[PDB]
Every structure is written in C-alpha cells, then in structure tokens.
Amino acid sequence: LYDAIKCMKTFFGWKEPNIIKPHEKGINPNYLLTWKQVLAELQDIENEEKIP
Amino acid sequence: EERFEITGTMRRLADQSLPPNFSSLENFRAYVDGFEPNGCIEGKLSQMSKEVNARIEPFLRTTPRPLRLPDGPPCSQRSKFLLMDALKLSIEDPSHEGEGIPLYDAIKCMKTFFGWKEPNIIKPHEKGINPNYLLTWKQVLAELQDIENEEKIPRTKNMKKTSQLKWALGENMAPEKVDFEDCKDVNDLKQYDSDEPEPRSLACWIQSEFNKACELTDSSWVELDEIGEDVAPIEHIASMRRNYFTAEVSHCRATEYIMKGVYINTALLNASCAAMDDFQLIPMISKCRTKEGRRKTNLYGFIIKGRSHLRNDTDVVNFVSMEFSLTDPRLEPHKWEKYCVLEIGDMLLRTAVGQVSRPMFLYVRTNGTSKIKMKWGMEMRRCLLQSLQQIESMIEAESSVKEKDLTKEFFENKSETWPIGESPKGVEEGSIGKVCRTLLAKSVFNSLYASPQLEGFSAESRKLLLIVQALRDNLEPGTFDLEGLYEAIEECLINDPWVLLNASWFNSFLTHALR
Amino acid sequence: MDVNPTLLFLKVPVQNAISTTFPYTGDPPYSHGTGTGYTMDTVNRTHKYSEKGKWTTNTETGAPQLNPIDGPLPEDNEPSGYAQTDCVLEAMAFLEESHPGIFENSCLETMEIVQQTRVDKLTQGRQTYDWTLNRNQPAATALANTIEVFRSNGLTANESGRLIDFLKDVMDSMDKEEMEITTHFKKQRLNKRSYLIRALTLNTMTKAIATPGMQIRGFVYFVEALARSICEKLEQSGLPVGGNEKKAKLANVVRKMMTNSQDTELSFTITGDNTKWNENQNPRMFLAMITYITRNQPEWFRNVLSIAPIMFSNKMARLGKGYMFESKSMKLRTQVPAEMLANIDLKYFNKSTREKIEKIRPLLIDGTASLSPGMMMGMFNMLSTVLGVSILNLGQKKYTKTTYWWDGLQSSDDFALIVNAPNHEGIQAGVDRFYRTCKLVGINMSKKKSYINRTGTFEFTSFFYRYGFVANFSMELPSFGVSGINESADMSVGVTVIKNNMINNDLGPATAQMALQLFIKDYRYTYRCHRGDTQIQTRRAFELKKLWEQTRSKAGLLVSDGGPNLYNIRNLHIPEVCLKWELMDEDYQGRLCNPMNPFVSHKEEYDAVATTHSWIPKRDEQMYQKCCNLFEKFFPPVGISSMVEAMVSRARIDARIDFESGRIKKEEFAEIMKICSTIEELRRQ
Amino acid sequence: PVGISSMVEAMVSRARIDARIDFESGRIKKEEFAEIMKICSTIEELR
Amino acid sequence: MERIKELRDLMSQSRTREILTKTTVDHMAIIKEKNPALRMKWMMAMKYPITADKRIMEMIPERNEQGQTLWSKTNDAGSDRVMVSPLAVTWWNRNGPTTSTVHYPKVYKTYFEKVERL
C-alpha cells in the first residue's frame, strides 16, 4: 500500500481526468468516478489517526 | 490657571522627607530658593578624611596572579543529550524528501542494527534504582515490536505506565501542599535549604568535548535558504563574508549539536503540549546530507516524557533519556555521575587492518526541562548568527585601522596564523576556518552549559582582559581594588565544568599575554 | 592542540573581538536573583551604608526611617549614603552657571508636557503593583483596577483625560479615612493607615528588584520628563540619545582632551562604574535637586514634581510572597507569607537566613520593611544622570583652580572620566578630587569594577572605544523565527524585525543576510510553502508546483506561493507584495488581490498589503459526561491519581467500612473485592 | 470491545451500556430496562 | 455494589477506557499555549486550520485534480464560517477569478511609496 503511495508521490503531473476512448458496451462515467475515488481515498489515509 | 495642592497626609510626609534640622517643606523651600554657593564642596573636601581616597595601584607585568580554581571531586556532564560520546543509527532516505514521521524514521533506523545483546548494567547511578533503568530500555525494545502487532499503525507511541517508568519520571514524588492553618505546628519542618553547591574540580573531558566540537564532519548539518541577488556594495561584501563562514561552519560538529538541540527540544515541546498526561516515546533524530550528498536520517536514542500539564514557562517536564554510545563509561566515570550506563549490544567494523568488534552502551539518566529551556534549545541556530557576528565584527575592526576591507585576505590566507590552541611546546596557531568553528563551538557550549556562573565570570573577567590589553598597549594601566576584582571573578568558579574550563583558558592566556 | 578561544587575544586586540566575551547575545533561560532573601539583603545593605543618620518614627506610617544626609563624612572607602545638601545644591548651582537657562527653559518645556500628558500614557510600562488586589499585574490592568476604586470613591477627576487630574485624585485619596472597592465576586474595606502602606509600597516580581504602586508611578514620569529636558541640553549625558548618535559622544570627549593637550600634559581615561548606585543616593537629595531647578517657577509645577521624592522617602518594600519550607520524612511543603513573617518563630530557619531576619525585624511594619534611604533600580535613571554630570561639570579648569582638570560621559550609574594634568601626581590628585567630590553627594565609584589607562582606549555603556573605532555588534538578537499571525503578516514582521535590528541594534549585514535565511527557512517549513521548483513533499507541494508551471514570471510569485526569496539588505523595508508587484503575471496578481476572495475578514507596527494570504486561523460529549457523572456517584479524591484508580480505591474503603459497621453481608463484600480486581486487570495492559 | 476481555463479558458489558443509554434518551420503558438488567445477571451467574 | 459493577462496564468499552486511565481528578474541572509561534506550527499540521465564509464551497471545488480535500463542512464559533486547508489559498491563486488590480497601488500608496525611493 505504502510502496504505491510513495510511487504516486513521485508524480506531480495529474490533470483533471477526461475520457479519451470509451468502452462501447459499458457505463463510461463510472470508470472516471472510480479513478477519482482511488486518488480521493488515498489522500483520506493521511486523515486517519492510525494509518491502515 | 493650573493649581496643585500638598495638604493633609501628603504635607506631613513632605515635612518628614527633608534633611535633618528642617521640620517644614516651606522652610526648606525658602533655604534652597535663597541658596548661593560659598565653596561648600571645597570646604567639606578639607573637612573629610585623607584615608578616603582613590590611590592607583599600578598594573605591572608582575601584578596579576593566575585565577584560583576550586578543589573537590571532578565535575560531571550536565548536558541534556550526549555530545562527543553520542552514537547514531542512520538510514539513507532519498525518494521521500520533506517533513515525514519521526516514530517510523526511528523504527527504520533501529532495524539497521542486528547486534542487540542481553542488556546488563556496566556503571550504575549511585543515587538511583538501577534495575528500573534496565527495565525501561527492555520496555522500549518490547513496545516497539508490539506496534507490528496492531491492526492499524499509530502516528506516535505512548509507553505503558509501569512501575519503573512511574519511578524514573518521578510520578507521585511531588510532596503535598499543606495550608499553614492546618500544619501550624510541625516539629521537623525546615525551609527549602538552598545549600552551598559543593565545589567540584575541573576534569579533562570538558576540554575533550570542546576540542571535538571544533572538528569538521563528513556531513553538511545546515542547509540555508536562497537570498535576493546582491546589488549594493555592502550586499556583495556581506554575501562574501557569509558564504566564506557558512562554508567552514557547514560540516562542523558544533552545527550537528545545534540540530540535535532544535529537533529534540522541538519534538519534546510538541509532545509536552499534545499528549499532556501520556508517557510519550520521543525519538532523538537529526538529518544531514552526506559528503557525496544523499539525505540521511540519524537516530541517537530515545526520550520518554512524563506528565506535562504545563501552566507556566518555568513549570517542569520530567523525562528519561536513553542514548546509544561506543564510549566505555568506566574510562571517565566522574563524568557519568548523573547517568546509569548499560551495555546493550556489539557493533562490528571490518576495517582495512581487519575485524574490530566494539561494544554498544546506553547512557540512561533521569532529567527535566521547561517551556523556556526547550524554546532555548529550539532557537540554538542563533549560535550561527552569534558566531558570524564575532567574525564579521573583528574584520570590520581590523579593517578600520587600514581603512580597506580585509574579508578576502582573512579567509584566503592559506597560512595558519591565528593563535587558537595550546600544546606541550606552547601556543599553536590555526586557519581562519579553525577560528570560525572554534567561535561557533564557544557560542554552542555557551548555550548548552548556560548558567548564571558563566554570565558572572564572562562580565568580571572581561575587565581583567581589558586591563591586560592596556598593559600590552603600554597605556600605564592602574587598578583601585584589583584583589576585589579577582574575588568577584573567583566567586563564580564553583562546580560548572564549562565556566571552570573558561577560567583555565584565562590562566592559559594570562601566562602567554605577559612576555 | 587543545583549542582555547581566549588565545585569539594574543593576535587580535580585546576591543576588536570584545563580541566574543558576551556569552549569550539574547536573554538566557534563568535570570535568577529576585527571591525574598534577596529583597531583605537590599533593605539591610541600604540601611548599613546610611546607618549613622537620624532615626525618626513616621507620624502617618508609624515606620522607623533613616536619614543619612547632612550626616557624618566617611573615614573609610566603604559606600556612604551620607550626602551633603550644601554640596549637592552647589553642584546644581555651578551646572546652571556652566549651562545658563538649562533649568528655567527645561521647566517651560516640561510645563507644556505635564498639562498635555494623558492618563493613557500610564498603561505603557512593565509589571506594576496593583494595590486594589494586593498583587503584581500588567500596567494597563493595574490602572483599570485603580480608576474602578477612584470611580467608586468620590474621585471622578481622572475621567477628564489628562494625567495631572488623575494625580489630583491620588492626592485626595491619601486624606480620605475610608478606601472602599467593589471587587465583583464583595465590598472591600481598608483603613487610612493600611491604604497608605500600599500606596507607598514596592513589590518584587518574577519577570528590576521590585516594581512600584500605580499612585507613585504617575509623578515618577513628570520628574523623569523634567530630567529628560535637562539631559537633552547636556553634552556629557549619554541619555536618551540613539544608537550611532552615541558612538560620536565617545569620539568627541577624547578629541576635546587630546587636541588641547601639548607635549607635557598627560591624559588618562578611567573606565567608570559606580557601586550600589540605588542603595546610597537618598530621595531627600532628589527633592533638594528638583526644588533648586524649579525655583522662580509656579507652585503647582513645583508641587507635582516634589511628590515623587516625598513618597520614595516614606516608602515600604514588601518581601515578595515569602519562604518555602519542606519536611523530609513527613513529605510536606508550606509557604509562610511576608504579612505573617513578623508574627512567626525565628528558631525554624538556618544560620544565614536568621541574621538577615534579626537585622530587618526592627524595620518590619505590617508585613512590609520600612526603607526611607536608597531606591529601587532604574526609577530616576535620567535625574541621577544630571547629578552625575554636575560632578563632571566641576572638572573645568575654573572650578578645579589647579593644573589638573577633567571631563567625561555619564548615564545613570555607568560613567567614563578623562583626567588631564602636567605630571602623574597631578592625575592622581585630579582622580582623588573627583572620587571625593562624588562621595559628598552619595556617589561611590566601584574600585573593583573600575580601572584607569592612558587616553586612547576605554568602555562606556558597553561601547568599547579603541583609538577612534568602537566595535560594531548586536548584544541582543531577536527571535528570527515566524510570528504566528498568518502567511501575509509574518513575512512583513520577520523582514521588518531584521531591518530594525540593523538600524537600532547595530547588527552587521552578513549576520542580517543569514538572519534573513533562517527566517525564510522557518517561514517555508511552517507554511509548507517550499519553492515550486524543489522536490520536497508536503500537502501544498502539488498546488504550488501546478501554480509554478502555470506562472511565466516566477520572480513574481510570493514566498507563500512557492516563489523565490527576493529580499536582501536594501529591500527589507519594502512589503513583499509591493517588492514583487511589477514581476507578477496579470492573472496571478488578479487572484492574489481580488477582495471578493473568501479568506480576507470583512470585505475592505508592521506594514502588509491585504491578499488571499491575509487569512484567519481557527481558535464524544455523552462519553466524557458519562465518566464524570459516575465520579459523582463516588463523591457527592487524590489530585495526582487518575479517574479509575481514585474510583477503585474509594470502592475498597467503603467495602471494608460497610463490612465492619454491618451494612453489606460477607457475600456483597466478596463481590465488590472480586469486581475491583477485574477493573485493575484491564488497566495494566 | 476490549482485546483482553472474553466474548461473553464483552457482550454482557455492551448490553448494560445500551440499556442505560436507551433508558435516558427514552427508547425502552422501565419494564424493558429492568428485563435486560435481570437477564444480564443470569448470564454472569453461569460464568 | 452497583457503582463498582458499572465501572467494569465502562472499562470494557475501549474509548471510555482511555478517558478514565488518561484524565486526572485535578483535570476534570477543565472538561467541565500563550506563544503564538508554536500554536501556528501546531495548527498548520492540521488538515483544516483556516476559517472562511460558506460561499467558498460555491467558489472553489471540494477536492483538486490529485483528490486533496480543500475545505470541510465543519462547525466554527459564532456563525456559518467553515474550515479550509492552506491548499485552497494556493488553489485560488492559480484558478480563482481575476478582477482589475489597478486601485491597489493607490489604496496602499502609504506602503507602495517605500518602493519609489529605491
């Protein structure tokens, strides 16, 4: 988990994410929300009193 | 029309607040109003005794004796943390830059050492329960492994309030406040005996400690921020002075001590106000860039904090201080009066001339501090400014006589020309660089061993120095009560190892200064 | 090689590296020496120097009072309080002769002041003794309390505004037999005698030896105000002139005594320091000075100025809080106050403390020690300087009437004296004549502290003169760190603090550059606002780098927006926003200063532009109250003990007292002791 | 629930806490609070 | 009997347990930092130390591109102000609205005149 967060913190080039080539047979807005949720929940660990 | 009146209670005080013979402010007022001078001074001069004089004992190359330093058992180390004896477990932490978490930085350091022995006591604290100091160290090692049991990892650790910790941190050793309405008559009740602090003799270690403070290291201990591009002539001269000095002080041990000062006192104050009534474990951390230049974290040991319900700046926080060292405490035991030292493991150094196993010790002691004394340690970087200003002020002064700035000559002069030390032969000289580090060490020790005894000895000795300077200037110097000055200087020399070395340093100068 | 910094002085002269003899440069963490034992030594030594003088009993106070002045001339070199009225006035007469109009003119200036001066002024100052609540307090709070009593008692003249009217109330307060204060909690009642003690009190603190009451302080101002206008008109006075303006005065007095001086004439400077300055010179002497200055002047002006010396000649010194005791076995400690130090036994104390109490007890009246002679430190600094200068003044060729003459510089107790004469014996004579003329007005040069050398080097107020140069170094460096207001302010403050220390405190440039570096370092760490190009990780790292990339002219960015530090010696007076104003991108500046922003507070001595950085920081309930309510079921305890082990300890006590008297059975006593051991096994782990 | 405590005395301890919090806020009556405290003492007498 | 059985119940809940072993008898009256320099350093450590008007929530987004929370719907003292991270101030200074800043050299003329002499 931390090996990942440490890697993530080496990149300071994140754009406002937009869809470039969608899944024809799928709900594309859900794929965007999931990525935003990852980014979100990763920062929420640095909110927790004790780190999981 | 402004109108101010002296009557009643005030007039009776006015009439009683005069010279003797005068019984009335208005009577006196009239004496002064119509006073005219009649050689009253010139008269009372001739009336006065000739034994009342300011006869000038002339100060000759022969008149000044060496200061008398007190006799007694050898002086003890009273610094918060170890200085030259200190030992550190280091990790290289490159990818993660900037403020991290100290607790984990420590655990990461701890895991670089796999040489922990069954800890046994090597030199005990005469005035202490030594088995408690051993149990506390075992408890640290124990509670550190217990974090790797917890489902969620904690930001800081709070030690379990055991007997040995409750003891060491002085829990329930504060005596009870008794209204004098209740304890009116008690037949063994004597005042807070401010005892004559038993005199101590100057031991060698204090000089050793300072010698090691003036040395360079393989580690930049200070990384100072950018500054506006230089424009005005002063700005170009300024930056030259600063950079030259900043260069020679960069890697000086004294600057490691400054960082040890800041980090520890910072971390101790943050804990003292955050976890007030918890026994928080507080890792003793510093950071440096290596001689090749990678960010390196250092763990010197641990401090466990007591209860810190701090109301005033004088209010006390008791703490235990477990510090790693390679130095055997049986070599200079007189130093480690206040410490109970354990032997807690073996280090291995496979050097060019073979394998060298050395034992690792743990200088544990009870201790305390206040917001004021913590702040003091947090602001220890001022030692850099104090050190630079001395260097800057000398150059400014030595340049005045010639009228041209000597900044470049001083620093570029690759000949060792400044008398800064002594050896069996006599006074040995050094580089301007050695002077910078020496003056820094002085400012740092002046902070670390800060005492009123120092304040006094600094102030009174200054006079004797300036007198001696006048003797060297052939300015026919004279004193009024030279024996009185010495008594005032020597009155400050009791037991403080730092003030005692400074007095040894004086006697050392005074011999060479008269030749 | 053993490193010894003092061996520098073999190469460098002591005046050049005098900077290295000042150990701290900043306030150290102790400043010890203001105990109750320390106050009683001042009271004793003050009387001991003045001990042959006339003892009186005060009519109003009922206090033993010593008057050493017009007393017996000294026959030893120990400190004498025995001043001589005829001598003081003569010194003050010959001053007004040597500086014609000085007093008359300086009175006219001060008559302008005394009217215009406002009560507001009195709030500025250190610790004060608040007689309202019998404590030390802040200055502004001590006045609010005092006017609240003066409001309650018929003394409403203070509410006119001017200070002279507040005094008029302080005067009328002494005559009143009752003194009542509504202390919101209780009407509080003081008889005329007990009030008077507190109005004339000096009280010791833990922040000077002792601070004075609010009644006495008012007058002390107007006196020092007069003493200022005098000092201002005297060349020799080293007060109250500025930093570099003073270094001049050192150069002047040497240049005066060294250009006249021919081949034959010797010149010696004595590095002066007067011993026990405050304990010797007597309030009655200051009254004698003031009344001679204010001759041919209106009575109202004469009076207000006379009041301060009068109070100081009748004053009482309270002995702090008291002595702290300690029982070894019993494990007690108890604080006996000052009030009940008179009505207390002498056999409990040690050998050093007994004698100190046995000497002062004759002076002890209502828990305060009577102190008619001497003063408390730094009170009449400027007036005491006039007296000092008046003795320097008597060193002119005319007043000496001899081949020796003298001049120099004086500021309170510190002085510097240059004596010229055709031969050595002449110098020795000139010195003695100064030393003895000084004794006649209660000025005792310290033989210990003082020394003498050929003119060319000396010290005065820690300015170390050496052949025309005085060494340049700041003796008190301020907190270089963050101020804790917000990003916007702290920058301005921090940069201002350095500039001010350069202009006032004589701080060198190279040191100021490093001072600036250490501030910026602290600033960026505190506010997580490390430069945009750096790799350091914080929460802000991302935002600041995104802004750094966006921004064209980066020298525009403020340090709090990851910009570069553009400050240096020259800039330090400019606010950062102004400094970088031209270099800012149009849109950046557009946002930085847009006052529709949600951060600034109300849409609108440090100088700061209002930006988004001008922000304002911030200042279960059932489960905390549930534990506190169960504690009430145990106590409808021991202070240091925790909640659970003061609950489990009360349970076993009620368990074994209800088992004896027979309230609970053997079954209900065994159940409590069982449960009391289940709670203790949850605590340990 | 506390780590060292067994299953039954971390179950019987949670019951009395919810019993006295639902009695204050007024969720269960005096009859349904007395019934929980009675059953909570039948479980403790089996231990 | 009932009060000592109740103390065992509260020591089985590990949150009520850590209010009984920490808190002292002296420091129960406080349940019922003069130096601002630390107080600031202390607060800057927190997620949301800065206060602002509720309109911020309409003006700047809750999270940035990297998913960092810029403000929180928290209780402030006397009114409907909310708590904000120093990220938000930087966010505003890089994505905020641009008004015309011609009047600031003229409003702060007293300050700006120190630059004209240099």
Ligand SMILES: [Mg+2]
């Ligand atoms: Mg002097």
